[PDB]
Amino acid sequence: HWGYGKHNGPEHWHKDFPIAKGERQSPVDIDTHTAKYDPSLKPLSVSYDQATSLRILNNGHAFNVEFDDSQDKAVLKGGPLDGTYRLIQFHFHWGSLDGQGSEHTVDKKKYAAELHLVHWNTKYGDFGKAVQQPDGLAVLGIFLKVGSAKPGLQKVVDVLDSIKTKGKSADFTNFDPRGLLPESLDYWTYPGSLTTPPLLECVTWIVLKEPISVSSEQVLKFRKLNFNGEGEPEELMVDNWRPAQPLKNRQIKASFK
Ligand SMILES: O=C(O)c1ccccc1[S@@](=O)Cc1ccccc1
Numbered sequence: 001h002w003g004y005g006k007h008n009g010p011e012h013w014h015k016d017f018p019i020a021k022g023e024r025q026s027p028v029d030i031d032t033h034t035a036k037y038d039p040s041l042k043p044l045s046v047s048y049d050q051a052t053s054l055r056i057l058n059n060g061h062a063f064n065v066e067f068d069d070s071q072d073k074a075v076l077k078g079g080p081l082d083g084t085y086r087l088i089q090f091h092f093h094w095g096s097l098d099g100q101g102s103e104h105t106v107d108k109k110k111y112a113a114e115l116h117l118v119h120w121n122t123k124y125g126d127f128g129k130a131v132q133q134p135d136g137l138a139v140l141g142i143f144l145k146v147g148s149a150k151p152g153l154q155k156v157v158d159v160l161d162s163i164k165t166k167g168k169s170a171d172f173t174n175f176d177p178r179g180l181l182p183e184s185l186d187y188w189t190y191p192g193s194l195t196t197p198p199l200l201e202c203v204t205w206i207v208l209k210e211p212i213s214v215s216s217e218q219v220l221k222f223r224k225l226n227f228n229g230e231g232e233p234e235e236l237m238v239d240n241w242r243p244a245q246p247l248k249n250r251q252i253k254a255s256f257k
């Protein structure tokens, strides 16, 4: 099915998922001069102290760190959000080279990777129902640049050898996602979509302005994963990012001056 190759990549997705050419697709380029500070935005609250991670899975597209969302533990609220959004999983998008990898861009600048912490609106009961709603999801996006190592990312890096191929998973309990955040919570926000099929238009995007630094050795290990399953020809999991989509009738708001 879909992927990131010449034959099944982003340019082909619209044939099975027509919403790929929709009115609120993600990612987008964030033009900093056009984004406007919004006084109506409330303070952003990232409450991950009670987070309960469970497993890490190579799904043939990226790797997902999954959480127990059966209760209000790790939640995101405030900012542009109405209500409480529960963390369900996080994953990354990255490149084959440090000059590319992120999905959102900032004044056309591409970062080496991008972290997505996916949350669903608790008013909808479960993730499946939330993805049938225009305000069903909130994704916290964080850029990664190559420089100093990110200590809080090392546990993820070290388990990747165990889930090299599509379909493999490993226990991944007691992981603290607080260790993946930058110091500042300044952000840009706009209404968009999931960046992977089915590309559903249910996401309030909150993209942090401050990138986190990770080491070249850390990202190099992301690039050793495989898109293929065990026993199949090796196709390195790199460049699993969708490029910027038309902004159309949308405005990007900034939480800062
Ligand atoms: O799929 C991609 O994203 C992809 C990206 C770049 C080059 C090739 C591919 S697919 O041919 C690899 C693949 C996937 C699943 C099972 C076996 C093989």
Ligand SMILES: [Zn+2]
Pocket (backbone or CB within 6 Å): 091, 092, 093, 116, 195
């Ligand atoms: Zn993503």
